[PDB]
């Protein structure tokens, strides 16, 4: 029955595989990427009329009937996303009259205008001189003097936030302004009677920081700031040291952009680092068939390649299938062998991790490393010396990254400081990188493939972590994926692999939870709203990926031969396309709970295949 679905899914995946032997699906987010790119160009005085055009199509293409933009497809209108998109358009050419601009402006007004937008959105407008710098949370270059074991030192922030802060310190130090031509001035973002509803700090504003912030805005006005020069060079240096091979910074949109501006501020437009970081942007761009152009918040080669392999294996292809070897070989060349920031906590840990993108050595993540090593562990490559060695280095690294609570973070160890969550500046998304259930789960499943069971201390400490973190209804939160189905599926699948007993009470209590949220159409769905409102916990339109997850959770718990189980499999079979692929008009990926969502293109093809491969195994 499903076999024909599998065969068709396989030849499809294999078709999508690039020549070098890796897979790479585009990553989706929201328009703040493109909108900020437009402004960045303006700042660096490098505007290409042709690019602006493609960008304008995209922006509009993404606008909804009501004239706004959301964080995910079918999501509620977002203020910040729309404010930025609005400014971006008005700069490209759009007159504040045209219908689209009308609808957007009205929504922006009905919300309290520019005065209600996140800190970033206001800062960008500050850079172009449309908002007072005095009303922007201050982040001094001097932050660079905090030691390794001090409150608020850069290494207390998560990798993604860290680089940004360092970069912005330099920017806010000078508080530069790059005026927009009169034609694009956006005063109408203030015209509003609605009371401005400002978003506070992620964890709550402590009067201390509030005070301090004002203290910094005052000091910022003095005539002399002793050692600031040194503070700035400290920041600049930190940046020149960690620039990524592709010319980016961390392989993410945020710090990259800011870092460039910081150099432009320091008259280094014709320094190697600046030039590289600039022409490096193109790689992250994407030409849309309808004339539009988009920029990616990040790229996922390693990731896609990793899952791609695992899926095709559980599917049926030989552990030495010449096509999967191209992947195996490729992955091996990716392994990082040099100390990154993670080393500040583990100076004696030997490098061996992997990263999300192509060439980003200073920021390998636990999630990727696990999937990659586990994937290789299933292949039989030509040089067994390399495969054997690679797996070892990586394995030993993942073990040395385990945090205090037995769980695994994503980039650093025990990055659980709760201090940064109160700073005025931090009011958007996560700022720290503590251990999560999904990452941990993935790690355990990686060990499980090797054999290491519950007998091993490392594993027990982790399993204990998961047990304590399980939700009342028996589900598991989803951090880097949407959401409880993603998490519940991850854990159960893992626990099953590390040897734990699938008959346990807490286990069963989870499987029942899965069968319970199965939609009528036989599949499973969970809307992104599940991060905001608990009513959407496991509820939502059925998607190929989210189904496959809730399905792996069942196959793992032994209930592979069940009603709900066979039911779901049917969904994947019927919803499949003639070419063998699958469609998924929703986001199943998470950046920051409730603040940033991602659309992983491959998920729709890879996961359904992996699930069907595991279902075929259960018989």
Which residue lies nearer to ligand C8E by CB, 338 or 455?
338
* Cα–chain center distance at 209: 28
Least CB distance to a copy of itself at residue 438 (A):
29
Binds 344: which of a copy of itself, ligand R23, ligand C8E, none (CB < 5-8 Å by kind): ligand C8E
Contacted by 187, from ligand R23, a copy of itself, ligand C8E, none: CB < 5 to 8 Å by type: none
- 3-state SS assignment for residue 271: coil
| Residue 325 interacts with, from ligand C8E, ligand R23, a copy of itself, none (CB under 5-8 Å by kind) | none
Compute the least distance from the CB of residue 249 to ligand R23, in Å: 11
Supply the DSSP string of 129-153, one letter for each residue: TSS-GGGS----GGGGG--TTSTT-
Q: Is 258 in the site for ligand R23 (CB under 6 A)?
A: no
CB atoms within 10 A of CB 265: 18
**Contact with ligand R23 (CB under 6 A): which of 26, 74, 203, 429?**
429
Residue 356 near ligand R23 by CB under 6 A: yes
* Smallest separation, CB 493 to ligand R23 (Å): 16
The residues that touch ligand C8E, with contacts defined as CB under 6 A, are 229, 232-233, 236, 241-242, 266, 268, 339-341, 343-344, 347, 362
Tokens at 311, concatenated: 């899926």
List the catalytic residue out of 341, 367, 433, 527.
Answer: 367
How many residues appear in the chain? 619
- HSE, CB side, 13 Å, CA atoms: give it for residue 221: 7
How distant, in Å, are the alpha carbons of 49, 494, 516 from that of 526? 41, 21, 13
Question: Residue 483: is the preceding peptide bond cis (ω within 30°)?
Answer: yes
Q: Which of helix, strand or coil describes residue 39?
A: helix
Question: Between 367 and 527, whose beta carbon lies closer to ligand R23?
Answer: 367
Q: Which residue is nearest to ligand C8E (CB)?
A: 339
Q: How many CB atoms lie within 10 A of CB 456?
A: 14
* Binding test (CB under 8 A) with a copy of itself, winner from 115, 210, 359, 473: 359
- CA distance from start to end of the chain: 13
User: Is 338 near a copy of itself (CB under 8 A)?
Assistant: yes
CB 245, min distance to a copy of itself, A: 6
Interface segment toward a copy of itself; rule CB under 8 A; list 85-93, 185-193, 272-280, 435-443 = 272-280
Q: Out of 137, 254, 277, 292, which residue is the one contacting ligand R23 (CB under 6 A)?
A: 254
Q: Which is nearer to ligand C8E, 268 or 458 (CB)?
A: 268
CB of 431 to ligand C8E, least distance (A): 19
Residue 301 binds a copy of itself (CB under 8 A) = no
Beta bridge partners of 18: none
Q: Which of a copy of itself, ligand R23, ligand C8E, none is residue 232 near (CB under 5 to 8 Å by kind)? A: ligand C8E
Count, residues near a copy of itself per rule CB under 8 A? 19
By the rule CB under 8 A, 276 interacts with a copy of itself: yes
Report, in Å, the least distance between residue 124 CB and ligand R23: 12
Query: Distance between CA atoms of 416 and 567, rounded to whole angstroms?
Result: 42
Query: For 151, phi and psi rounded to 5 degrees?
Result: -60, 130
Q: What are the two backbone dihedrals, phi and then psi, of residue 285, each rounded to the nearest 5 degrees?
A: -75, 170
- Calpha distance 74→361 (Å, rounded): 36
What does DSSP say about strands 285-287 and 293-295: parallel, antiparallel, or unpaired? antiparallel
In this chain, which stretch among 1-9, 18-26, 296-304, 567-575 interacts with ligand R23, using CB under 6 A? 296-304
121: closest CA among 155, 152, 156, 78?
Answer: 78
Between 346 and 380, CB nearer to ligand C8E: 346
Burial 182-221 (b: 16+ CB within 10 A, else e): eebebebbeebeeeeeeeebbeeeeeebbeebeebeeebe
Beta-carbon count within 10 A of 455 CB: 9
Q: Which stretch binds ligand R23 (CB under 6 A): 54-62, 209-217, 422-430, 510-518?
A: 422-430
- Quick note: the x/- pattern for ligand R23 over 582-601, rule CB under 6 A, is ---------xx---x-----
Distance CA 364, CA 498 (A): 24
Four-point Cα dihedral 278, 279, 281, 282, nearest 10: 160
Smallest distance from the beta carbon of 567 to ligand C8E, in angstroms? 51
Q: Which does 373 bind (CB under 5 to 8 A by kind): a copy of itself, ligand R23, ligand C8E, none?
A: none
d(CA 474, CA 467): 10
Q: Using the rule CB under 8 A, is 361 a contact of a copy of itself?
A: yes
Q: How many CA atoms lie within 13 A of 290 on its CB side?
A: 9
Spell out, one character per residue from 211 to 240, where the chain touches a copy of itself: x when CB under 8 A holds, - when not. Answer: -------------------------xx--x
Whether residue 168 contacts residue 238, with contact meaning beta carbons closer than 8 Å, is answered with: no
For the question of residue 48 being annotated catalytic, the response is no
Q: What distance in Å separates the CA atoms of residue 468 and residue 525, rounded to the nearest whole number?
A: 26
- Span near ligand R23 by CB under 6 A; candidates 40-48, 50-58, 183-191, 362-370: 362-370
Q: Are 513 and 473 in contact (CB under 8 A)?
A: yes
With CB under 6 A as the contact rule, the residue among 298, 377, 488, 547 that binds ligand R23 is 298
Phi, psi of 292 (to 5 degrees): -75, 165
Residues designated catalytic: 367
Which residues sit at the interface with a copy of itself, rule CB under 8 A? Answer: 236-237, 240-241, 243-245, 247, 267, 270-273, 275-276, 337-338, 359, 361
Which residues sit at the interface with ligand R23, rule CB under 6 A? Answer: 160-161, 164, 252-254, 297-298, 303, 356, 365, 367-368, 426, 428-429, 431, 480, 591-592, 596
């Amino acid at each position: 029955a499903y076999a024909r679905t599998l065969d068709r899914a396989v030849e499809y995946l294999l078709s999508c595989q690039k020549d070098e032997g890796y897979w790479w699906g585009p990553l989706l987010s929201n328009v703040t990427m493109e909108a900020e790119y437009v402004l960045l160009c303006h700042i660096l005085d490098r505007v290409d009329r042709d690019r602006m055009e493609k960008i304008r199509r995209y922006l509009l293409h993404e606008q909804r009937e009501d004239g706004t933009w959301a964080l995910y497809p079918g999501g509620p209108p977002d203020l910040d996303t729309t404010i930025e998109a609005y400014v971006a358009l008005k700069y490209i050419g759009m007159s504040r009259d045209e219908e689209p601009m009308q609808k957007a402006l009205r929504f922006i007004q009905s919300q309290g205008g520019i005065e209600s937008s996140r800190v970033f959105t206001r800062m960008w407008l500050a850079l172009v001189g449309e908002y007072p710098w005095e009303k922007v949370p201050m982040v001094p270059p001097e932050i660079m003097f905090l030691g390794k074991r001090m409150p608020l030192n850069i290494y207390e922030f998560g990798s993604w936030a860290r680089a940004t802060v360092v970069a912005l310190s330099i920017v806010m130090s000078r508080q530069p302004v790059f005026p927009l031509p009169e034609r694009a001035r956006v005063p109408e973002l203030y015209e509003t009677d609605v009371p401005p509803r400002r978003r506070g700090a992620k964890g709550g504003g402590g009067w201390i920081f509030d005070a301090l912030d004002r203290a910094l805005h005052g000091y910022q006005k003095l005539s002399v700031h002793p050692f600031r020069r040194a503070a700035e060079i400290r920041a600049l240096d930190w940046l020149l040291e960690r620039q990524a091979g592709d010319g980016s910074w961390g392989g993410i949109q945020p710090p990259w952009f800011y870092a460039l501006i910081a150099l432009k501020i320091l008259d280094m437009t014709q320094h190697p680092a600046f030039i590289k970081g600039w022409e490096g942007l193109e790689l992250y761009g994407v030409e849309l068939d309808y004339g539009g152009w988009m920029f990616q918040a990040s790229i996922s080669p390693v990731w896609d390649t990793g899952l791609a392999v695992l899926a095709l294996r559980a599917a049926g292809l030989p552990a030495d299938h010449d096509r999967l070897v191209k992947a195996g070989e490729w992955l091996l060349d990716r392994q990082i062998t040099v100390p990154g920031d993670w080393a500040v906590k583990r100076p004696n840990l030997k490098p061996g991790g992997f990263a999300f993108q192509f060439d980003n050595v200073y920021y390998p993540d636990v999630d990727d490393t696990a999937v990659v090593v586990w994937a290789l562990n299933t292949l039989r490559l030509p040089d067994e010396r390399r495969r054997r060695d690679a797996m070892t280095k990586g394995f030993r690294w993942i073990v040395g990254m385990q945090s205090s609570n037995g769980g695994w973070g994503a980039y650093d160890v025990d990055n659980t400081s709760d201090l940064p969550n109160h700073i005025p500046f931090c009011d958007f998304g996560e700022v720290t990188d503590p251990p999560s259930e999904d990452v941990t789960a993935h790690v355990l499943e990686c060990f499980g493939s090797f054999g290491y069971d519950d007998a091993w201390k490392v594993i027990r400490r982790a399993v204990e972590y998961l047990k304590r973190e399980q939700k009342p209804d028996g589900s598991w939160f989803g951090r880097w994926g949407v959401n409880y189905l993603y998490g519940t599926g991850a854990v159960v699948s893992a626990l099953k692999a590390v040897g734990i007993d699938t008959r346990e009470p807490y286990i069963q209590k989870a499987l029942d939870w899965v069968e319970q949220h199965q939609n009528p159409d036989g599949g499973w769905g969970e809307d992104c709203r599940s991060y905001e409102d608990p009513a959407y916990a496991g509820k939502g339109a059925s998607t190929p990926s989210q189904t496959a997850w809730a399905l792996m959770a069942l196959i793992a718990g032994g209930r592979a031969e069940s009603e709900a189980a066979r039911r779901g499999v049917q969904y994947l079979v019927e919803t499949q396309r003639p070419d063998g692929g699958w469609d998924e008009p929703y986001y199943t990926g998470t950046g920051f709970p409730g603040d940033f969502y991602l659309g992983y293109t491959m998920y729709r093809h890879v996961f359904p295949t992996l699930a069907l491969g595991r279902y075929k195994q259960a018989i």
